[PDB]
Amino acid sequence: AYQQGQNQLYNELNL
Amino acid sequence: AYQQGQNQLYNELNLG
Amino acid sequence: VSVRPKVPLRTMSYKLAIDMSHFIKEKGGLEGIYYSARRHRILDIYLEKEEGIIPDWQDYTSGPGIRYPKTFGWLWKLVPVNTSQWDDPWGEVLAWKFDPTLAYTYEAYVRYPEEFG
Amino acid sequence: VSVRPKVPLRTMSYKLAIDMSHFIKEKGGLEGIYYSARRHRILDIYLEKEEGIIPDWQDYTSGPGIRYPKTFGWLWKLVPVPAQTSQWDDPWGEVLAWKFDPTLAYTYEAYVRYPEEFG
């Protein structure tokens, strides 16, 4: 769930 | 001798 | 997806800053995105977890107005558009914007040299 | 004379390069002086012993022609102006000379012209 919630954040940067 | 040597080198660049 | 490997830490150099700037640029990230103290950290973690960059590089000029990168090489600045505790102190709405000029122009230091010690 | 005491080391920065550029110029150094790999090093020592600057800043574009500084803020470039060859001579067989240029402060000419020499 760690390296998955990180992707949630990255998307806010369109990354 | 060490300081005088380096100053000799500097003079080539017009320094010291 | 599957758990991905760690990346060997390293400080962001000029060339590394140029490379990271374009890489992200070509990905379609950052550009036009609204900025906040929160999303600022997200980026620190991104280049750290994805590229191993030590989070001591992302420093901008205080403001107001355009916020220029304190690290020479980084090609992303903060520009005003047109409450939260991640909000800009100057009460300005900020957004990321790619500036190629910043590859050979130290806008940050030439405009606000006093913000450097 | 008196032995000059050691100066605490520091890595050259943008402002430091600016300062040292003007400082050296105002003393009458470098300008119009024939560059060589040997004298290149004399410049490293000078700034190290006298200003404590780490000798890792003085890098130039490979050439030929004008050699631009790979440290932004360093306002000294190399400009072309030979009997028997010296092993301190330029690989392009060009005679180079130091030339001051304050323009080098506001444009990173090196990266602008030869982006490939970075990395």
Numbering used by the authors:
A (entry chain D): 63 to 77
B (entry chain B): 63 to 78
C (entry chain C): 100 to 181, 200 to 234
D (entry chain A): 100 to 180, 197 to 234
From the manuscript:
Nef from human immunodeficiency virus (HIV) or simian immunodeficiency virus (SIV) is a 27–35 kDa viral accessory protein that is dispensable for replication but required for high infectivity and virulence. Notable among Nef’s functions is the interaction of Nef with TCRζ, the principal signaling component of the T-cell antigen receptor. In previous work, SIV and HIV-2 Nef have been shown to bind TCRζ at two unique sites denoted ‘SIV Nef interaction domains’ (SNIDs), the first containing elements of immunoreceptor tyrosine activation motif (ITAM) 1 and the second containing elements of ITAM 2. The Nef conserved core domain (Nefcore) has been described to be responsible for the majority of Nef’s interactions, including the TCRζ-binding activity of SIV Nef.
In the presence of the shorter 18-residue TCRζA63–R80 polypeptide the complex unexpectedly crystallized in the P212121 space group with severe pseudo-hemihedral twinning. Ultimately, a partially twinned crystal with a twin fraction of 0.426 was used to solve the structure of the SIVmac239 Nefcore–TCRζA63–R80 complex to 2.05 Å resolution. M was calculated to be 2.64 Å3 Da−1 (53.42% solvent) for crystal 1 and 2.64 Å3 Da−1 (53.99% solvent) for crystal 2, which is consistent with two SIVmac239 Nefcore–TCRζA63–R80 heterodimers comprising the asymmetric unit. Two nearby molecules (A and  B) in the same twin domain related by an approximate 90° rotation were selected to comprise the asymmetric unit. Clear density for the TCRζA63–R80 polypeptide ligand was observed and this region was also built into the structure, with 13 of the 16 resolved residues comprising a canonical α-helix. The P212121 crystal form contained two molecules per asymmetric unit which were no longer related by a crystallo­graphic twofold symmetry operation (y, x, −z) but instead by a twofold NCS operation, In the tetragonal crystal form the SIVmac239 Nefcore–TCRζDP1 complex and its symmetry-related partner (y, x, −z) form an antiparallel dimer similar to the crystallographic dimer described previously for the HIV-1 Nefcore. Structural alignment of one SIVmac239 Nefcore–TCRζA63–R80 complex from the P212121 crystal form with its corresponding molecule in the P43212 crystallographic dimer reveals that the NCS-related molecule in the orthorhombic crystal form is rotated by ∼10° from its corresponding molecule in the P43212 crystal form. TCRζ residue Gln65 additionally participates in hydrogen bonding to the main-chain amide and carbonyl of residues Arg103 and Val102, respectively, on its bound SIVmac239 Nefcore partner. Interestingly, this inter­action orders the proline-rich region in the N-terminus of the bound SIVmac239 Nefcore into a polyproline type II (PPII) helix as evidenced by the clearly resolved electron-density maps calculated from the P212121 crystal data for that region.
